[PDB]
Each structure stands twice: as structure tokens, then as C-alpha cells.
Amino acid sequence: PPSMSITRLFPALLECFGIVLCGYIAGRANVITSTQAKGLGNFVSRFALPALLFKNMVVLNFSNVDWSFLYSILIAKASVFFIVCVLTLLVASPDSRFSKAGLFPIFATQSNDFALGYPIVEALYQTTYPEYLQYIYLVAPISLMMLNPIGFIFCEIQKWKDTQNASQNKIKIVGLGLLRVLQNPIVFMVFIGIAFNFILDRKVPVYVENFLDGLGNSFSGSALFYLGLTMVGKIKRLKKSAFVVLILLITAKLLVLPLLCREMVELLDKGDSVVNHTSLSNYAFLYGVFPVAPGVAIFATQFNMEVEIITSGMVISTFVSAPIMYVSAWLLTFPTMDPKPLAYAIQNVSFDISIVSLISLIWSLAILLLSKKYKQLPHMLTTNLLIAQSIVCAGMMIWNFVKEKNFVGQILVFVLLYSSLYSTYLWTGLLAISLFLLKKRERVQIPVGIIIISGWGIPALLVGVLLITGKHNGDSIDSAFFYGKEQMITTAVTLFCSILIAGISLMCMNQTAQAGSEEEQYLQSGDQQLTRHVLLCLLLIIGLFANLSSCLWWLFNQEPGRLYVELQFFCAVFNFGQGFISFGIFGLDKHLIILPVSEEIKMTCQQFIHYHRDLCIRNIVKEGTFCGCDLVSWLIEVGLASDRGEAVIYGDRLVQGGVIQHITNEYEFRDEYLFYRFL
Amino acid sequence: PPSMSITRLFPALLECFGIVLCGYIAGRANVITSTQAKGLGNFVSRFALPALLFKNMVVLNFSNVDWSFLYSILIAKASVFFIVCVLTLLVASPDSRFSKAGLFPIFATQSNDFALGYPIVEALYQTTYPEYLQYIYLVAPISLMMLNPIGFIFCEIQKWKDTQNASQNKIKIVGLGLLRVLQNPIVFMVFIGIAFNFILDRKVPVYVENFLDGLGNSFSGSALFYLGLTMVGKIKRLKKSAFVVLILLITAKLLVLPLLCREMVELLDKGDSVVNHTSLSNYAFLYGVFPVAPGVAIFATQFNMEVEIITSGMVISTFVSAPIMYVSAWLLTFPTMDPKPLAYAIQNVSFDISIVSLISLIWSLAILLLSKKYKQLPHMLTTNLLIAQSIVCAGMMIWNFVKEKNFVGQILVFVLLYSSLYSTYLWTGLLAISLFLLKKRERVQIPVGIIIISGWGIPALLVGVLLITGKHNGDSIDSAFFYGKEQMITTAVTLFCSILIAGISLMCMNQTAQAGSEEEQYLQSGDQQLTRHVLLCLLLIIGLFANLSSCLWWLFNQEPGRLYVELQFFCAVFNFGQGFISFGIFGLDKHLIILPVSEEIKMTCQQFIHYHRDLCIRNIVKERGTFCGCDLVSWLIEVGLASDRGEAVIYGDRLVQGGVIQHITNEYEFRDEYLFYRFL
Ligand SMILES: *[C@@H]1O[C@H](CO)[C@@H](O)[C@H](O)[C@H]1NC(C)=O
Numbered sequence A: 001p002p003s004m005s006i007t008r009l010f011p012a013l014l015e016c017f018g019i020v021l022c023g024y025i026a027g028r029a030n031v032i033t034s035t036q037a038k039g040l041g042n043f044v045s046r047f048a049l050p051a052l053l054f055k056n057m058v059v060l061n062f063s064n065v066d067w068s069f070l071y072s073i074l075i076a077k078a079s080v081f082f083i084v085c086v087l088t089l090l091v092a093s094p095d096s097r098f099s100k101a102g103l104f105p106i107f108a109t110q111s112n113d114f115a116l117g118y119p120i121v122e123a124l125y126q127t128t129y130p131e132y133l134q135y136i137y138l139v140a141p142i143s144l145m146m147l148n149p150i151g152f153i154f155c156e157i158q159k160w161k162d163t164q165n166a167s168q169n170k171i172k173i174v175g176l177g178l179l180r181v182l183q184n185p186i187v188f189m190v191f192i193g194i195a196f197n198f199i200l201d202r203k204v205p206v207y208v209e210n211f212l213d214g215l216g217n218s219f220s221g222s223a224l225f226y227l228g229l230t231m232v233g234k235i236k237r238l239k240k241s242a243f244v245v246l247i248l249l250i251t252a253k254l255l256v257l258p259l260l261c262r263e264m265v266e267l268l269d270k271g272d273s274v275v276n277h278t279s280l281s282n283y284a285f286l287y288g289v290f291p292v293a294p295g296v297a298i299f300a301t302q303f304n305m306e307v308e309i310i311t312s313g314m315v316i317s318t319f320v321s322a323p324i325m326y327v328s329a330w331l332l333t334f335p336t337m338d339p340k341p342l343a344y345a346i347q348n349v350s351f352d353i354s355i356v357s358l359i360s361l362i363w364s365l366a367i368l369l370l371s372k373k374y375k376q377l378p379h380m381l382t383t384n385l386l387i388a389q390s391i392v393c394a395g396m397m398i399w400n401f402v403k404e405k406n407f408v409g410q411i412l413v414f415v416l417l418y419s420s421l422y423s424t425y426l427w428t429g430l431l432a433i434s435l436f437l438l439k440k441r442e443r444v445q446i447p448v449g450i451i452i453i454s455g456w457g458i459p460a461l462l463v464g465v466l467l468i469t470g471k472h473n474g475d476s477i478d479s480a481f482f483y484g485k486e487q488m489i490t491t492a493v494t495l496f497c498s499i500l501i502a503g504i505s506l507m508c509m510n511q512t513a514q515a516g517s518e519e520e521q522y523l524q525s526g527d528q529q530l531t532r533h534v535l536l537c538l539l540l541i542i543g544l545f546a547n548l549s550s551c552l553w554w555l556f557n558q559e560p561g562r563l564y565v566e567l568q569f570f571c572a573v574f575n576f577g578q579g580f581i582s583f584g585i586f587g588l589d590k591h592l593i594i595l596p597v598s599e600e601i602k603m604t605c606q607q608f609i610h611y612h613r614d615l616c617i618r619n620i621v622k623e624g625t626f627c628g629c630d631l632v633s634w635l636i637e638v639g640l641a642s643d644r645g646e647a648v649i650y651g652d653r654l655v656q657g658g659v660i661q662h663i664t665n666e667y668e669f670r671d672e673y674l675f676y677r678f679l
Numbered sequence B: 001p002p003s004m005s006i007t008r009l010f011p012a013l014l015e016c017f018g019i020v021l022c023g024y025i026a027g028r029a030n031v032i033t034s035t036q037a038k039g040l041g042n043f044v045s046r047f048a049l050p051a052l053l054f055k056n057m058v059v060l061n062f063s064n065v066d067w068s069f070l071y072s073i074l075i076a077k078a079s080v081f082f083i084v085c086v087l088t089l090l091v092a093s094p095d096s097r098f099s100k101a102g103l104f105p106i107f108a109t110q111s112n113d114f115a116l117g118y119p120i121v122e123a124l125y126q127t128t129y130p131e132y133l134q135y136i137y138l139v140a141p142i143s144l145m146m147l148n149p150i151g152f153i154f155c156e157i158q159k160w161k162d163t164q165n166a167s168q169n170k171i172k173i174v175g176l177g178l179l180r181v182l183q184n185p186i187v188f189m190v191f192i193g194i195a196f197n198f199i200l201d202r203k204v205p206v207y208v209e210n211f212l213d214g215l216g217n218s219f220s221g222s223a224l225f226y227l228g229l230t231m232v233g234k235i236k237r238l239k240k241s242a243f244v245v246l247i248l249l250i251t252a253k254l255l256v257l258p259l260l261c262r263e264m265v266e267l268l269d270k271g272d273s274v275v276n277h278t279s280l281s282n283y284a285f286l287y288g289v290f291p292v293a294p295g296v297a298i299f300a301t302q303f304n305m306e307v308e309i310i311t312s313g314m315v316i317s318t319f320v321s322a323p324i325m326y327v328s329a330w331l332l333t334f335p336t337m338d339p340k341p342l343a344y345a346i347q348n349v350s351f352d353i354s355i356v357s358l359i360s361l362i363w364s365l366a367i368l369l370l371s372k373k374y375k376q377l378p379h380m381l382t383t384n385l386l387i388a389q390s391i392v393c394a395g396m397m398i399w400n401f402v403k404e405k406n407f408v409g410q411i412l413v414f415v416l417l418y419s420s421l422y423s424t425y426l427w428t429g430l431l432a433i434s435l436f437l438l439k440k441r442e443r444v445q446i447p448v449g450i451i452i453i454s455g456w457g458i459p460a461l462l463v464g465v466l467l468i469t470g471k472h473n474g475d476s477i478d479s480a481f482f483y484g485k486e487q488m489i490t491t492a493v494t495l496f497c498s499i500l501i502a503g504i505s506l507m508c509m510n511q512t513a514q515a516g517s518e519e520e521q522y523l524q525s526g527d528q529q530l531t532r533h534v535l536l537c538l539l540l541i542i543g544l545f546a547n548l549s550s551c552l553w554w555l556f557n558q559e560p561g562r563l564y565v566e567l568q569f570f571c572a573v574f575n576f577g578q579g580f581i582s583f584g585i586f587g588l589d590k591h592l593i594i595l596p597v598s599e600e601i602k603m604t605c606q607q608f609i610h611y612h613r614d615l616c617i618r619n620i621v622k623e624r625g626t627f628c629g630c631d632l633v634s635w636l637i638e639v640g641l642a643s644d645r646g647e648a649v650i651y652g653d654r655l656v657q658g659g660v661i662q663h664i665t666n667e668y669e670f671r672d673e674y675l676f677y678r679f680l
């Protein structure tokens, strides 16, 4: 029988994470400020989500539910909750372990079922298994009801113990926990919808069906866009211990929980069919990979506990769940697929990732170009790493079309593709050593020519050597085997060399960092960008090792097993999605990316002039000038602006109304520690 | 052949105007402030609407378009634009006629096609005529492109002439007009989508299809909810001339334009099939009834011209387009329907309006009850008018089920229904005379007992007389004919009496008004509520005359024509939707309806204490440490701590919940209602 419908997953992930990208880009551009974002959030959470829940709860046929799936996912979440909660209580400091042990387990267990899970489960299972869609709306509310009051109880215990009203007792603590759970619109409208599922005989009474549909159908896009908006400023830099804790919590949500879900289904589902049993446990895994709900960050801010870790982790979890979902769904379809269609399938994964990663790379190239940063170091070498990744993705798009044709011209496509791929590897090496040479004392100036020459020519020369030494096999569907064992050796050699160069050079960069224990802010900006390049080199090093280990496993075991095609698929993912990694690291400095009278502005200027002007000057101005960031901080502290977004837009109005200007008037209003004057 | 699918229209109008009601209620409760509302608006207009447009433009098969429909609707809009523009240029004052002649024609022509038009056209035509859905996405952008730059040119001329940079010329004026049109995301993304319709061979390339679907599918609900949010404070009281101008512009949009659309289709569509020609001109009318786009109000605020008239008119137009759409769609289906199914159809119209109007009346009753206003006058009599309307709607729900059964018990159902209906008529009379007796000098105190006694007993007595004088006919499907000519006479008598009592008493109330040429603000609130009751009596008087004229037309012409079943359908509409009218007039005083420390609040209090406290006191506080709540709201707005009265009340609510302030007796929470507060 045919599979779960896996070719529909990438379009659905583009829906999900591209609408989240739209929300992020809109908030980052201050098209929608955080105050404005709360309107979309209130629409979502108070109207669209409860209507979606109510409709799907009234329609739901409770006689047909596979309660074993609910029990298994629920017990998987309950056991992850037990693990994370008991661990946190044992490990965390007594000043905060109750807040942490409340919110960290909710983090580890509460999935983004509605906004992200449902479109993905729809796209995967709507045609093949339309009953699996019901279990989104079942598992998520029942999970809130069972598991969230335990975590809320621990947070209320933090409040009780910190406020020291020690005469109070279990009734108030447990009651406040349960009351938060009952008040939550998810739980609230699921009880209401279950009640009406029985009051009506599952028929939405026609009159309100269109109303409920209109609200619910809007939830999907609006919740994804609101998720993007809430992600805008959230990746704050954390303590090293908080980064380790984040990795543990994100691993709980995205790796431990789906594994436990799959195992629990294979324990509790004692139904007959092996194919439907496998599809159910595959769905259990997919369900486990969903990211953390933004609702957990709402809980954290409502308790004002662990807000930084939970918000940052919800954001990072959302980003990380996309590649893990794609990887995992394909991996689960593979052990139900034949080897030639499996080759074509990996080449469609490669083609998908390479097309949208190429568009990500074209954007990142426009960044490095129009910022003029491509003239500075390391950014010149980064531009070459991005051009290498772009030609990798282009070569993958060319290969997917050419692999069955132009039998000699496959050599040109292979030269393009694998010379550029070896170039991305070797540029990982050369960019890492550029970071070492930049962190070392600046008199050790980088030999730019030699390094760019090597970054392209050594890959070109290596592929020429491969053309000399290897034997053609265009009948191999994957580019990765076009010259067989010689290609695998040359690739392993390239990667082992690059991993050595990069590991050694990052260790030496680290040692020069240990030894360290407008133009000035632009140089400091270059150093901070170098630190982002350290992050890039670390992530790319992980990917390099993924590819090296795959090559080594094939070379060691030239009769490859199922784990080898897991590794070949993950190799494709890194090889072609490293462009997404770049795009996620260089999509940051909005002003460097983009930049290089109305009655509303009149009112802004009059509000300032007639009232706050002298007070502001008395607070900020020194020998008629002030930093833009300090006016932003003042507008926030004084409450004229709700956030840094409104603060920059109020500064933009005050500049466009001439209450202020930049000192040389060469720049518009910015948060970037530029300097401004009153007129 | 079967009709356009008219039973799907009421559920679609509930989608549309109930999600608009959700947005309105959410904004009125300050669940979403106006600043917060701009986020939903920017999502809609900058992402969801352009994605919807792009997808539907790429999919659109341009070989199959009935260009004659586009041309006809476009020429109908262009002629309405010409009429309204030339008229406004001739009639309006020279200080403003260029701004008015820009924006009033855009008002008269630009429909709310996407948010409200498309769900309705979907529900009506999706199964029967799925090609008619394309023409939403064609007519609306092409209408913007052709007609909006003319109006924008007139507004830019207002700017040029008021700023007096007289050395400038046509190039800048016309260029700014065209540039506003081109920048508009509708026009922008339709040009982009048409280009991609040809670049791709109409195939959305699978990868972005789900992305575009996710954004576009969300447009519907989010745009309706945003329309509700933008409607919250907008019905500002206008000059009498502005009210007349509003009626003319709303009539242009909702009555002149659909008639011209229908006529233009019947001129330009020279295709073969009569059934498909009739469905096309019916669609042209339906398309014309769509309300004014909120985009026109965005244009008005961006020019800062005619903002009050246009915003208020967009709001009122949205409200008025709902009953006119329902009425019109059913009326257009009637001349393609058989008489017994036409009777069942009007009973289903009556059942629809009566159910949701009954829920509106249950809400309005909860208003009058929990505000305790039902003890005060005129509100006691208004509670009786609402109970009469509730028992009317309940009787209609009972009649729709009973009319084929319980052949003797139909008498009990008829007694309930038509005694309560006669009671709503007679209560229009008695409420109007209560307004006269309240506007007259207060020593002329109302005889409450006699008036409530009459308001229920005279209808009960009249229906008893009908039971005596009439002949039963349960085989008549409509309640309105259950006792035939005697029922029509008794109804006409009831209405003629009520219209006389109400017209005379409203004229006498008007004469006492001409002669006029915390407890104090609560009494003034009672008088303002009486003025809202004047509005109710006026609207109900229109409905009374609708029913009286229908009864008279049948009694005069006892072989009724097609126009008589138009009038019987409109009678049903008023008889059972007067509850919506009440619900739209009594859903106003939120605090009277509903009412009778966090780090965020700490931060609010600290922002005030550490900075604005002394400045505020120096501005507002007097020896009445005290200040009105409305004045702190006005100050928070003028000082920019709050963006609007919504944020201002929520900041006052935080400052109260944080104890920076309290009410003078602490008996009340923070309000805009000229209550009085103190610092601590
Ligand atoms: C598997 O699921 C399909 C689709 O829901 C259903 O038709 C079929 O009966 C199921 N088979 C088994 C063995 O459960």
C-alpha cells in the first residue's frame, strides 16, 4: 500500500515556517510593533483558536477515537514530564527549582499542536489517514489538562515560598493551578465543545458552521504570523549554563518526547494491522517533534519566572523543529520504500532543500553585497562561502534535471556541483582560520589572495583529480556516487582536511580569545559579526562531521545497510541546507541589510515639544545631543513607547518632523548608538 | 433548473457580520485596543490580502472570463463615480469640494469585495456558478485602478490648492494620484499576480501553494474581525447636513450602484441563455449591495479629508448592507420560484431572522435587566417592547414548526405570535408617547400602570376580537394570513393606530424639544438614552409603515401581484428583525451593561510615580487631590502615554489596580464616564 503522503510535507513546512518568517520579518522591520502584535495574538487566542477547537470538538465522533493513541501520547508526555520535573527538582538551585520544575516540564511536553502541528498533520495524513487529524485536537487539550496544573502548582509554590505567606495551604496552591488551567481558552473551549458534542448530535447547526469555519480557517495563518511576531527580539544571549539547559529542554521536546511517543504507541496499540500500526507509531514520532508552544512563554511571563530561557527556547525550538520534522518524516517513510524510489526520494529532498536554500542564499548574498560588508573581513570569505553554497544549490537543481540525460554533459554538472560542495567544506576550513587570524593580533594580516585562491582552486583541483582517477557512472541516480569509491575517498579527504583545519583553527582562535582575558562601533560590529561567524563555523563543523562520517561508513562497509541511507539522507540535508544555516545567521543587522509632514508626525512632534522636550533634554542631553539608543531607552522608561519598536518609530517620527536630526544628518533614526541633535 | 443557493446566505451573513460583531465587541471591551488593532490590520492588508489576491490571480483562466460582466460592473461604477463626482463638484462648498469630490465617489463605488463580498458570493454561487467568484478578484482591483486615481487627483488638488504652491502642474498632481493607486497592495499584487499568471502557466508551483493558501484562507476571518475593531468608536454624531450627505452616499453605494450594475449587465451581456443571463444580472445586483471598503476610510485619514463622514459612512454602510443583501438576494430568487415554495421560503426567512434576532433580544434584555435600567423610564416600557419582540421571535420559531401540525393548537401559537406582534406595534406607539411625556415638563408624570396595561392588554384584546371575528385557515402557510382578511384588517388597524399615536407623539415630543430652546450625570444619561429611544421610534416607525402599506395593498387588491410578495417579504423582515434594530441601539453603554499586583501594573505605577505624577497633578488636580477619569484619559492621550481612549482606560485601570489612584468613594472601577478619582 502507498505511504503517508510525504511529498506534501515540504509545501506544508513552507506554509508553516514561511508564514512564521513573514511574521518575523514584519516585526523586525517594525511593520508591526509588539503592541500591535498583541492584537493579532488576542484574535488568535481568544477567537480563532477557541472557534477552531469548538468546531473540531463538536464534529468529533467519540465512538471512533483510537483511545490507545491518546493514552500512549499522553503517557509519553506524562513520563517526559516526570523525568524533566524530577530531574529539575534534584538538580536546580533551591532559590528557583520550583519555578523551573514547573515550567521546564511544560516546555518539554507542550507541543505547538494547533498552529504548526495541524497543518503538517493535515498535509501528511489528510488523504491517507484523516482520523489522525482528530488526535491533534484531542491530545493537545488533554495534555494541558493533565500536565499543566502540575507545573502551575510548582510555580505557585515558588510564589508562595518567595512571598512567605506560610500560613496558606494546599487548597489555595492547587486551586490557583487548576484555575489557570481551566481559564486557558484551550481547556475552556474544549470542555464547552465536548458538552456541545453531546448536546447536539455532532451536527454543527448550519447557522454557526460558517461563522466557526471563518474564525477557525483563519487561525492557521494568523497564529503562524503571530508566532513570527513574538519571535522578533527573543534570542537574547544567555549564560553558558542556560545554553546547556536549553539544549537539554529542547532535546526533551524534540528527541526524547517523540522517541517515547513512538515506543509507547508500540506498547499500547495492540490492534491488528501492521501497516496501520506502523503509520500510527510514525505519526506518534511526528507528533513528538512539534516545537514548544508559545503558550509556555505566555505562562512564563505571567508567572514572571524563567522567562528568558523559556522564550528563547520556544523560539529556538520552533526553528529546530523544522529540519528535524522534515528529516524525521522522510526517515520514517524510508523503511517502507524501495531502493530506486529511495534514491529518487533523496534527490527530491535534495532538490526541495536546495531550491529554497538557494533563495535563502540569494537573500544572504544581497545582504553581504548591499551592506558592502563583502569588502571587509571575514565577510569577504563569507561571501565566498555563500557563493559556494549558492553554486551547490544551483548544481543540485541542475543535477536533479540532468541525472537521466546529457550523459557526457553530466560531467559539467558534476564539476559545478561537487567542486562547489568541496568548496563549501574547504571554505568552512578557510573561514575558521580567518577567524583565528582575526582574533590573533591584527599585525598577522590575512593573505586574502592565497586564501580565496585556495578556497576555490583547491576544490577545482581536487575535482580535476577525481575526474582523472574515477570511473563515470551516470546510471547512479545520486550525484554523491557519480565517481564511486574514488568520489567517496576524495570527499572524505576533503572533509577530513577541512575538519582538521577548522577544528585546529577554532581551537587556536579560542586560545587567542583566552589570551584576550562611529568607526569604533563599526569595528566592534565587525568583531560581533566575527562571533556570529564562530557560530556559523560551529554549526558547519557539525555538518562537516555528518558528511565525513557517512563517507567513512560507506568506505568501511561497501555493502551499505539501512543506517547508511539514514546517513546519506542526513548528508543531503546538511550539504544543501547549510544555506539555510547561513541565512539564519546573516539575517540579523536590518539597517546594514536594507539602508545602504503628516498630521501624525505633527502630533508626535507637538506631544514632545509641548511636554516632554525639556524633561528629556534634562535627562539625556550633554555637551544639544543624545544617542538614539538612549532616547529609545528613555521613551521606553518614560512610557511614551511600549517597546524598542515603538521607540524607534517615535524617533523616526520626531526625525521626520524635525524635532531632531542626526549630528551630520547622514543617517536616519536608529537604535545603533548613533548620535542625534535637537533643532 | 435550480436557483442560486439562497439558503446558504444567512449562514454566510452570520460568518461575515458575526465575525464583525466579534471584532466590534472585542474592541469595545478593550480586549484589543486601536494600537493593538493595527497589527491585525497590517497582517490583513500587507500579507493575507496580497497573498489571497496573488493566488487567485495566478490561478485565473483569462480565456474563460466573461469580460462583459467586468465591463458592465466597471461601467456601472464609472457612471456612479461620474454622477457622484459631478454632483459633488456642483453642490459642495468651494473650501472642500475637491476633497469631497475625490472621496465621496470612491465611497459610492469601492465595495468591500474581499472581506464581505467574497464569503457571500462563495456561499451563494460556489456550487451553482463557480466562475462568478473570479469576478470579485477581477472587478475590485480593476475598479481601484480606474476609479481611485480620479478621486485621488481631486484630493491632491485639495492639497495643492490649500497649500498654494501654485507653480506646480498636472504632472505632480496626477503622478501622486497614480502613485497612491500603484502603491496600494491590491493594485500592486494584482499586477504582480497577473504577470505571474503568464510567467507560470497558471500553476501555482506547489511549493508556495500551501503558503499562499495559509495566508489567503486567514484573510477572511481576520479582515472581518479587523473591520469590527475599526468600527468601535466610529459612529460619531454629525451635523444634520452630514447626515443627509451620508444617506445620499450610502444610497449611492447600496441602492443606485446595484441597480446600475443590473441594468448594465442586461445591456452588455448579449449571451444566449436566459437562466444564465438572469443569474449574471442577479449577481450584478448582489455585487452592488456590498458595503463601502474600510480602505476608503484609510484613504480619508491619509489625506486627512472628510474623515468623519467617510469613517461613519463606511461603518453605517457595513451595518446597512447586511439587511439589504439578505432582502435583495431573496427578492431576486422569488421571481424564479413557485408560490407554495415561496410561502415556505418566506417562512424560512422569518425563521432565520427570528432565531438570531431572538438571541439579539435575549442579549438586549440582559442589558436592560442587569443595568437595572428596566426600573427607570422610558426603559421600563422599552423592556416591554423588547419582551414583545422576544415573544414575537419565539412565536415565529414556534409557528415555523407548528404550521403543519396541532391544527387546533395553532390557535395558541397564533395568539402568542400575533398578540405579541400587535404588541410591538402598539408599544412603538406607547414608547413614543412616553418620550413625549418625558420631554414635556416632568410634572406631567407618566401613568405607568395604564400604559403597560394597554401595551399588553390592547393587543391581547385585539387578538381576542380577531379570534371572534375571523375564520380559521391553518392550511395557510404564513401566520400572516391565518385569519385572512379579518387578520389583515385588524393588523392594518393596529398599525394605523400605532402610526398615528407614534407620529403625533413624536411630533409633540419634537415640539417640547423646540420649546426647550453623579445623579446629574445619571439623569443626563437617561435623557441621552431617551434620545437613542427617539432613534428607535423613528426606525420602528419606518417598519410600521412598511407593514401597514403591505396590509393596505393586499386589502385594496385582494388578487395580489408580485409586488405584494415583495412587500410581504419585507414585512416579515421588519416584523422579526426589529429585534436586531433594538439590539443595535441598546448595545452601547458597556459599563452599564457589564459591571452592575502584576509586574506590568507595578511598571505602570512606577512610570507614573517616578515621572509623570507631579506634572499630571499640576495639569488636572483641583480642590474639588482629585480628578475626573475622562480628564486623566484626555491627558494620557494628549501626553502620549496612551494612544487612544482605549489604552487610556487600560492605563487608568492599571494605575487603579496598582493603587496610584482610586475612585473618590472607591465604589467604582476606572471609567471614562466623568466619574471622579483621587491619588493616594
Ligand atoms: C487502516 O486505515 C484505513 C484508513 O482509515 C482503514 O480504511 C482501514 O480499515 C485500516 N486498517 C486496519 C487494519 O486497521
Ligand SMILES: *[C@@H]1O[C@H](CO)[C@@H](O)[C@H](O)[C@H]1NC(C)=O
Pocket: B272, B273, B274, B275, B276
Ligand atoms: C450556464 O453556464 C454553465 C457553466 O458555464 C454552462 O455549463 C451552461 O451551458 C450555461 N447554460 C446556459 C443556458 O447558458
